[PDB]
Every structure is written in C-alpha cells, then in structure tokens.
C-alpha cells in the first residue's frame, strides 16, 4: 500500500487544449521539419548528380538582375520558396570566404564580403530572402564564423545581432562561442592601431 | 536633448524588427496573405501616422 | 399529378439544403429526417403506380435524393440501398432479372434505345459504384463502366482512366431538382478510387506507382482533410524511396492545411528514426503527445464516406496518447534517456490504473504487448532511472493483481 502510495502519479490526467497553442505546436512542428532540412541535400536528390557559380552557370557575369533570376529558375524546379534557396546559397559562399585563410579578416574577405552583401540587399529589397533560414543556416555553420562577418551582417541591416541570438536552439553554445571570441578580441586591439579601429567599433556596437 | 531621440528610435526598431519578421513570414507563406496581414499593417500605419515629421 | 410529386420533391430538397446550409445540429436532423420520410412517401406513392415512362425520371431522380440523403446521415451507407437501386433498375426495366450486373447489362441496351432520363440513369450509376467501391467490387464496377462506353474498352483494366472516359451526358437540363449530378458525383469517384489505388500499392511496396495515382488525387477535388492525408502518403512514398528532403515538404504542407497533425508528425519520428535523428525524433513525437489531446457534415455525398477507416499497416494509422506515450517511453529508454523514459513510463501506467472516475484510455490494438509486458518495460526504465525502491512498489502491485512474466518480475525486482 506504501508501494501504491508512492507509485499514485498526478501530471497524468490531461483535457482542454488552447487553440494558441494548436499553433504553437504546429509551429515549433514547422520549425522542427526544416531544421533538420537541408538545401544541398535536395538539390542532389530532384536534380541527380551550390554556389552562385552553379546557379549563375561557370562565371556567365556577375549582375544582381541575372543571378535573381536564377533563383527563381532553381526554385521553380525545386518547388522550395526562393528565400531560403538564397539564404543557404549566401551562407555556403560566407562559409568558403571565412575558412580561406585570430579574429578579424580584413584585406579581400572583405571586399568578397561586400559585394555578397551588396546582392544580399539586392534579393531583400525584390523579397527573395528568409531571414529566419538563414540565422538557421549560420548556426549549422557556428564555428567557420569570425565576429566581424557578424558585424557587418549587423551595421549593412541584413541581420540584427538581437534576432541572430535569439534564433539559435542551444543559448549556452551561443554564449560560450561569444565569450571565446570576445576574449580573443579583447587580447586583439593591441596588435596595430589599425585592427584596433574596427575591432572598437564592434565592441561598442 | 536626446532622451526624445532614443524615445523615437528605439519606438521605430521593435516596429521594424517585428514587420521584418512579419515579411519573412509572408516570404515563408508561414501565416497567410488572406488577411490580418492587412489589418496589422493598416495598425502601424495609424501609430505612425499621429505624430508624423514633428518639423525644427 | 406528376406536377404534385414534383413540387413535393422541389420542397424536400429546398427544404434539404436549407438544413445543410443552416441550422443547430439537432433542428438540421429534424428537417432532413423530415425530407426523409417526405421522400419514403413520395417514392411508396410512385412505387404504387405500375411503370410510367414520364414517372421514371423523376422516381429515380427521388430514390437518388432519397438514397444520398440516407446515406449521409447514416454517415455510411447499407445493403437497403443497394434493394432500393435494385428496385428502382427492375422498375426501369419491367416498363419494357437475374442480378445487379445482369440487370445493368439489359437496362443500359434499354438507354442505347435513348429515353431521356439517362441523367438520372448515369446518377444511378454513380450511386451503385459508390456502394461497389465502399464494399471493394472494383472487378464489378469497371465490368459496368465497360459495359456503359464502348466494350471496345475492354483491356482498360484501370479504373482512373474508365472514370475519366465515363462523361456525364447532359448539364444536367432543367428537370426535377437533385442534391447532387453525375459530375459532381464522379468528380467524388475519380478522388476516392485515386485515394484508395494509392495506399493498396503503398502498404503492398509500391513507393513509385503511388505518386502518379497520388497527384491525381490532389489534380480534382480534395477538401483539405483529403490533401491532408494525400501529403502524409507522399512523405511516406519518399521516406520508403530514401529520399528524405522530398518527404519534409509535403509533410510541412501537411502541417499547415490541417487540423489533425499527428499522422505526419508520426511520420516524421519514422524518418528521424530512418535516420539516427534520435533527439529530433524524440522531439517530434513530444510534440505529437501534446498534439492528440487537442480535436463537419453535408446531405450529399462528399469524399470521406467512399474512403476505408485505415489499417494498422497504413501511414494514416494513430492510435490514442497512451499507445504514442509508450512509445515515446520506449524509444527513450532503448536510446538511452532512461530518467525521461521512467518519468513518461509512470506518466503512462498511472493513466490506465488510476482511471476508473476519467474516460478511460483504449487499448493500442491486439497486436500491441499485453498488460504484464508493460508493467515490465516501465520497471526496466526505473531501473536504468536507478528509481529501484518504485521498481519493488510496481512489482509488488503486478504480484498482488494476479508464467515467463512472473519470474522476469522477480528478476527486475533482483535487479532494483
């Protein structure tokens, strides 16, 4: 009886549902079955066996117009919302730039990084871009990544700091890949006046 | 001053970060493009619209 | 007089729709079975008479109205049915036998001699397929089709293609009213042997023919519960095939046009499961015991009558939040959660010994483990928990309730 007693369960009995969070369940559902989606993955899957090279067709040109147009033909094929197909494109392209070789990169890095960027705001301007997926497809990569990417994803407006942190599952992995940075940073902005500039910039932002 | 400023700025950002949002989802077809889409807009139109370019 | 019946019909059938359209579910079931019995009448009235050439087109026309309406209220339809369309045919037929396709055989030569009611007559047709294809007949209902067009198509063994050359042979011209005409009524055909072709070559290992009968479900009308369904089938097409990220899409359209998002959500585990995705399966299924706590019709006939209540084979199977809850717990335990997996164990075996005052929760179907083998499972996971003294509780309540079980009980509480 002191079996019973100490088996006798409570949180089990469960009626009435919230139609919220009907939602909320579909939606972290939703959430859930694109997380672990993956781009590249469908593409050699419809199409048999991505950069904007095999979008754009072996260095054809390098036109903003051209490249959407693309995207939409890609996506026309894929049947996946054009947004995401660029997303994932733009953070494959950030990935290879960023591993080409510590925190800042600052000779062509950032003049790849710009004119990118300066498609990026292109494809937001023609609303061709998730930026959801995409803080998604940055935290798949989560370690390639140097705080300045970040930062000038930060001051051209493609991303505030604020959503990229708050659309990552694990908040500890985020934290403690900040605090690594920060601490190399912080030991950086002593190595050339120069550096110092950019890398005070950011810590203040 | 500037405690009006950052009043004003800081009133623009959530806007702006929550319509930036909104248009994802619209790039998603997450939520709809029925309506309330509409609706919600045409509420930050008129909360904007009140105190429109305060001019000195 | 023939205006009489015919006002009658015109009223019951307003009168019908009306119920359909408006009303409280208690005052729709009154007026419609009130046009009910208006019809039963109307149908003794007209049975009464010997044949009527005039009649006929309006007698069929009423033992359609008649049979629909019974048919979606019963929610499903009987064997009366089938003796009313036998009624109504040998009626035809004694104007100027043996069995049903012997009957249809002699009535659609008696058509080829063109009496204009063959709108009633290829309603009928949709009527009697209807039953055929809610009680598996598909050798007999392409048999009748064969019959109605050329029987030059004779090799066209499929049904979807018959069904397609099958054409309704008026707009359906101002006569007597109906619920439903004989578009609107293949319209329903083409969709539910689409539906049931695809999950028959699905269960029976068939993940390539499926998509093609699959896409011509959604390719004609599919209300939404019907698209629902259709996309969980894709995903498990896929899933089978080992192509994953096709499976996601239709299964994420799923999500967002239904209102019922288990099916898929089980479907996900699997493909999480498919994969190693052991923490995203985990979660899925989480998700989906939460979801299955959480929860309308038309006097014509819809879609959902002519589909089957699913197999335990099926994709579109779901049990009840205690069958999924174990399953939860076990997927937990074999992975290696053994703490979540205890605590989802108690959460479980308390819901089915603690309700006796609640509704109480079904069995997960015959093939499913027996009571003792449960009550085992959760003392495995209190023990991989290190919960040892709740493993002794459970095993002394199994001995005091009531073989292998037995000693495997003494073994567990060795082991705590």
Redesign the interface.
């Given at each position: 009886r002191?079996?019973?007693a100490?088996?006798?369960?409570?949180?089990?009995?469960?009626?009435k549902?919230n139609?919220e969070?009907?939602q909320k369940?579909?939606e972290?559902?939703?959430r859930?079955?694109?997380?672990?989606?993956?781009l590249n993955?469908?593409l050699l899957?419809?199409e048999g066996p991505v950069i904007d090279c095999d979008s754009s067709e072996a260095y054809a040109n390098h036109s903003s117009s051209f490249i959407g147009s693309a995207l939409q033909d890609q996506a026309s094929r894929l049947?996946?919302?054009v947004?995401?197909l660029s997303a994932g494109m733009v953070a494959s392209s950030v990935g290879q730039i960023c591993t080409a070789p510590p925190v800042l990169l600052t000779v062509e890095q950032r003049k790849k990084l710009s004119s990118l960027l300066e498609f990026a705001q292109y494809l937001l301007a023609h609303?061709?871009?998730?930026?959801?997926?995409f803080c998604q497809e940055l935290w798949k990569i989560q370690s390639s990544l140097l705080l300045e990417a970040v930062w000038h994803l930060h001051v051209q407006g493609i991303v505030?700091l604020?959503?990229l942190l708050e659309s990552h599952p694990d908040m500890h992995a985020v934290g403690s890949w900040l605090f690594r940075n920060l601490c190399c940073l912080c030991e950086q902005m002593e190595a050339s006046c120069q550096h110092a500039d950019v890398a005070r910039a950011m810590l203040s932002d | 001053r500037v405690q009006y400023l950052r009043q004003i700025h800081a009133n623009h950002e959530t806007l702006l970060r929550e319509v930036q949002t909104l248009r994802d989802r619209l790039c998603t077809e997450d939520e709809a493009s029925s309506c309330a889409t509409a609706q919600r807009l045409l509420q930050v139109y008129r909360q904007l619209r009140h105190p429109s370019l305060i001019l000195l | 007089c023939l205006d009489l019946w015919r006002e009658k019909n015109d009223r019951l059938v307003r009168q019908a729709k009306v119920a359909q359209n408006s009303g409280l579910t208690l005052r729709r079931q009154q007026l419609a079975q009130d046009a009910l019995e208006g019809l039963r009448g109307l149908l003794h009235s007209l049975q009464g008479l010997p044949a009527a050439v005039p009649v006929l087109p309006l007698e069929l026309t009423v033992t359609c109205n008649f049979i629909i309406l019974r048919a979606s209220l019963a929610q499903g339809f009987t064997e009366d049915q089938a003796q009313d369309i036998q009624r109504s045919l040998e009626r035809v037929l004694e104007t100027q036998e043996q069995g049903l396709r012997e009957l249809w055989d002699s009535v659609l030569r008696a058509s080829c001699l063109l009496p204009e009611l063959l709108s009633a007559l290829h309603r009928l047709v949709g009527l009697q397929a209807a039953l055929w294809l809610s009680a598996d007949r598909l050798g007999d209902l392409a048999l009748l089709l064969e019959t109605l067009n050329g029987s030059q198509s004779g090799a066209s063994k499929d049904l979807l293609l018959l069904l397609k050359t099958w054409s309704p042979p008026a707009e359906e011209l101002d006569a007597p009213l109906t619920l439903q005409d004989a578009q609107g009524l293949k319209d329903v055909l083409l969709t539910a042997f689409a539906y049931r072709q695809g999950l028959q070559e699905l269960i029976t290992g068939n993940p390539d023919k499926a998509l093609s009968s699959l896409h011509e479900a959604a390719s004609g009308l599919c209300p939404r519960p019907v698209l629902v369904q259709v996309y969980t089938a894709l995903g498990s097409c896929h899933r089978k095939m080992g192509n994953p990220q096709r499976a996601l899409l239709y299964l994420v359209a799923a999500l967002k046009e239904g209102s019922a998002w288990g099916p898929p959500l089980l479907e996900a585990s699997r493909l999480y499961q498919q994969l190693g995705d052991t923490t995203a399966e985990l979660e899925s299924l989480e998700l989906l015991v939460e979801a299955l706590n959480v929860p309308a019709p038309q006097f014509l006939i819809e879609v959902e009558l002519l589909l089957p209540p699913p197999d335990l084979a099926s994709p579109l199977h779901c049990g009840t939040q205690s069958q999924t809850k174990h399953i939860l717990a076990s997927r937990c335990l074999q992975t290696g959660r053994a703490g979540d997996a205890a605590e989802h164990y108690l959460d479980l075996l308390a819901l089915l010994l603690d309700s006796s005052e609640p509704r109480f929760s079904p069995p997960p179907s015959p093939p499913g483990p027996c009571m003792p083998e449960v009550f085992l499972e959760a003392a495995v996971a209190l023990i991989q928990a290190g919960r040892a003294q709740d493993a002794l509780t459970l095993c002394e309540e199994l001995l005091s309730r009531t073989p292998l079980w037995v000693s495997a009980t003494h073994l567990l509480q060795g082991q705590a």
């Amino acid at each position: 009886r002191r079996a019973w007693a100490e088996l006798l369960a409570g949180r089990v009995k469960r009626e009435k549902y919230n139609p919220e969070r009907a939602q909320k369940l579909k939606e972290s559902a939703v959430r859930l079955l694109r997380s672990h989606q993956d781009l590249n993955a469908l593409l050699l899957e419809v199409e048999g066996p991505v950069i904007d090279c095999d979008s754009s067709e072996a260095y054809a040109n390098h036109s903003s117009s051209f490249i959407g147009s693309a995207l939409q033909d890609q996506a026309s094929r894929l049947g996946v919302p054009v947004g995401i197909l660029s997303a994932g494109m733009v953070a494959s392209s950030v990935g290879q730039i960023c591993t080409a070789p510590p925190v800042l990169l600052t000779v062509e890095q950032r003049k790849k990084l710009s004119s990118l960027l300066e498609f990026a705001q292109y494809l937001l301007a023609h609303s061709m871009f998730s930026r959801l997926s995409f803080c998604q497809e940055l935290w798949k990569i989560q370690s390639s990544l140097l705080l300045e990417a970040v930062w000038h994803l930060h001051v051209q407006g493609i991303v505030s700091l604020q959503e990229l942190l708050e659309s990552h599952p694990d908040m500890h992995a985020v934290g403690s890949w900040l605090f690594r940075n920060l601490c190399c940073l912080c030991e950086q902005m002593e190595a050339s006046c120069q550096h110092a500039d950019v890398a005070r910039a950011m810590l203040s932002d | 001053r500037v405690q009006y400023l950052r009043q004003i700025h800081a009133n623009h950002e959530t806007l702006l970060r929550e319509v930036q949002t909104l248009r994802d989802r619209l790039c998603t077809e997450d939520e709809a493009s029925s309506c309330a889409t509409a609706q919600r807009l045409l509420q930050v139109y008129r909360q904007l619209r009140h105190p429109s370019l305060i001019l000195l | 007089c023939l205006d009489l019946w015919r006002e009658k019909n015109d009223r019951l059938v307003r009168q019908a729709k009306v119920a359909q359209n408006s009303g409280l579910t208690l005052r729709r079931q009154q007026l419609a079975q009130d046009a009910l019995e208006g019809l039963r009448g109307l149908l003794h009235s007209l049975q009464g008479l010997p044949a009527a050439v005039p009649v006929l087109p309006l007698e069929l026309t009423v033992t359609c109205n008649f049979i629909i309406l019974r048919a979606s209220l019963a929610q499903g339809f009987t064997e009366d049915q089938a003796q009313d369309i036998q009624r109504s045919l040998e009626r035809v037929l004694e104007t100027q036998e043996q069995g049903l396709r012997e009957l249809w055989d002699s009535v659609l030569r008696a058509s080829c001699l063109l009496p204009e009611l063959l709108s009633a007559l290829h309603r009928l047709v949709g009527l009697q397929a209807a039953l055929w294809l809610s009680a598996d007949r598909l050798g007999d209902l392409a048999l009748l089709l064969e019959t109605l067009n050329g029987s030059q198509s004779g090799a066209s063994k499929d049904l979807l293609l018959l069904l397609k050359t099958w054409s309704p042979p008026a707009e359906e011209l101002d006569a007597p009213l109906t619920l439903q005409d004989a578009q609107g009524l293949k319209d329903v055909l083409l969709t539910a042997f689409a539906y049931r072709q695809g999950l028959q070559e699905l269960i029976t290992g068939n993940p390539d023919k499926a998509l093609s009968s699959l896409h011509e479900a959604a390719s004609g009308l599919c209300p939404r519960p019907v698209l629902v369904q259709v996309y969980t089938a894709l995903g498990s097409c896929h899933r089978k095939m080992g192509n994953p990220q096709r499976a996601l899409l239709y299964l994420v359209a799923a999500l967002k046009e239904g209102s019922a998002w288990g099916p898929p959500l089980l479907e996900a585990s699997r493909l999480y499961q498919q994969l190693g995705d052991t923490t995203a399966e985990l979660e899925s299924l989480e998700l989906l015991v939460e979801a299955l706590n959480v929860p309308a019709p038309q006097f014509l006939i819809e879609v959902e009558l002519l589909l089957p209540p699913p197999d335990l084979a099926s994709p579109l199977h779901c049990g009840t939040q205690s069958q999924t809850k174990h399953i939860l717990a076990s997927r937990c335990l074999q992975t290696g959660r053994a703490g979540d997996a205890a605590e989802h164990y108690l959460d479980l075996l308390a819901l089915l010994l603690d309700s006796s005052e609640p509704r109480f929760s079904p069995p997960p179907s015959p093939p499913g483990p027996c009571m003792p083998e449960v009550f085992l499972e959760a003392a495995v996971a209190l023990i991989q928990a290190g919960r040892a003294q709740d493993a002794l509780t459970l095993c002394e309540e199994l001995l005091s309730r009531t073989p292998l079980w037995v000693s495997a009980t003494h073994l567990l509480q060795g082991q705590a």
